[PDB]
Amino acid sequence: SAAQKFVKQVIREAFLQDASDIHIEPRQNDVQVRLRIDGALRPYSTLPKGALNAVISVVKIMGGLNIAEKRLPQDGRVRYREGAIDVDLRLSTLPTVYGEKAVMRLLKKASDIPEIEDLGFAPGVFERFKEVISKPYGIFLITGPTGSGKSFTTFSILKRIATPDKNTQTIEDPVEYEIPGINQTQVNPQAGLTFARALRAFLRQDPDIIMVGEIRDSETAKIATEAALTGHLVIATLHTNDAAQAITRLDEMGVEPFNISAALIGVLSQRLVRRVCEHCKVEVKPDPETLRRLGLSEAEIQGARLYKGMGCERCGGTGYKGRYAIHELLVVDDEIRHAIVAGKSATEIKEIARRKGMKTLREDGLYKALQGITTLEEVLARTIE
């Protein structure tokens, strides 16, 4: 609790300062602590060398990390409420030559779950998206790397489709949000209430819409798929970078390809790019050759404006305030499941979908960058694979 009270004092003073990050760094003879204020790291405090393991355990408990594991990096998430400071923290631990270093990123205050029309879909992709989630049943997968806005998009969907004539039931680890009109159930491993234990009880609970917060079992993948097969609408998340790899991911978790093919409505992969500041924004002229290589049509290449923030402190550092989302939406059709039943590659499906008109993250990112929402760099950074 010497350790616990230090950790809680740091997060507090980080919150009140509007600090973005907190670094706990072992050194040769001490542990330095630093806070990023207005873009720069500042010295907060100094802990003795022996104090290291104590503190690292406290933040590991907070994010559900493994204490025993010290040779490998771990990431986690901390929903932190103590009194008047509620901040969500992104947690990172890293093996360092002097012991384990921890970094906690203070996330922007979430605000409220938006309507479907304010998620930042391209006008064209939006219509196909609205058609995927309006379907009576089947499973709709939302994927992306840690913190790409999966849960946020998921609840925006539920906000739309969970009508009083339906039973919307939810399994989450943990439950975020107090969204009305639906029933929410949190995973309890203490009790024995796993994802699969719950998901099987849900089938005896007369559901219409099932939201599976996370699929990380074979049991869960199988049950969610059969729920989609028998006539329920399932929304679930995976942690996969490619929309097509989500299909392959399910094959690996033990789902029969013919069941994947019969239930899957589509897969949404998204990213978050920083938004350029509207105030210190400037026009930039792109190398036509770059645009060309990015698959942008010649005949579109003359309008040709890209944008970037030089910076003020409405931005702080950066030229960026806020984040926006990037999407590629794999809508399953007669030909795609016609590729899943056959031996597939994620690769083959992707271009089988691109033809038929599927717009890719980079294409989606590029086009929003052409609007001055984001830089081309942020777009490239998120789509490099």
Added chain:
Amino acid sequence: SAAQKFVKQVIREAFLQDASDIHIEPRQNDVQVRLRIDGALRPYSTLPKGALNAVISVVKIMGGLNIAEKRLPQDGRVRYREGAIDVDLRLSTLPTVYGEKAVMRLLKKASDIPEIEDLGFAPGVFERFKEVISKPYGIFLITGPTGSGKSFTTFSILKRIATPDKNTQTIEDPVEYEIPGINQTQVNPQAGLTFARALRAFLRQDPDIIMVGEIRDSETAKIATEAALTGHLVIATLHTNDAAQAITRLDEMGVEPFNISAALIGVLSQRLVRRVCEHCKVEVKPDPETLRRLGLSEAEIQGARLYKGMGCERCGGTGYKGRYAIHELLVVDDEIRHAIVAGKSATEIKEIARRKGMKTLREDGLYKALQGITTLEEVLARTIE
């Protein structure tokens, strides 16, 4: 006794309203109770939040569930008798963030099962339906999501064709109705009595008619087809959005296409639409332009009498009371047989079937909406065409 009084009333009201399920839902500041009627959830009442644990208690006593346990789902069965009420109830309790939700399902009986004349078949389809079930051997598939009326149709058929000169054998998970005249067997995991293990045994039981409640696995799909092949009549349920996809799905499940083309009598795809309440029923002047994009001809727009129910006390305000089935009946002939082998797609099969006389779900829906059985939107909400 106040919680006893509530449970008594809500089951009484569900019974008289023909309600599938009672939902008792803990929410943030109250308890909400919903009735599913005609497949649609409907608000029944609100309880004050501190009355939850008394009500759940009554429900648990009925089904012999543990009161102490509130962290894990529970399941029960009760034969409920109050006044003249005699219903079997299936009880489900499930922990949510605001406490345990309860679902009580009102179960049907054999007496509720219709005669095939009352299944709602259009006159042209009904004559073909009859010729399909009156064949000596082959496999007949009934497909669609849960709550489509698959079991009602199945046993309706067995009421007409399980005459006393034949052995009529059933494998079910679970056995729902107790039917006179036929032999029924329930799937039992704990003993190892699979669908496939049961079905293997049926072939040494001198059967005539075989009913497979559900085809989930690849082995069951093969043995049921084999049993059809050798000279037995097989009625089985599958989940597909479409009659033609039942062919493709058997393929995907591993059945040899030459075996499918050899054994398959036909497929029935089925949905349930809501009937227009006839205490609200008000005639509505059709819009021709909207009836033209919907593939209806000029002749059909004449002789078109649409209706919509202007909500009343008897329909709970919905404008609907009762349900009705819409049908897509694929009847296998030689051309469909040659297309099943030669591995044509479901879309190819479907277009063959229609040219040969098959009405799609949408078309059967539209046809009955023009009779004022149901409304247009119900047809559009229950069919992706």
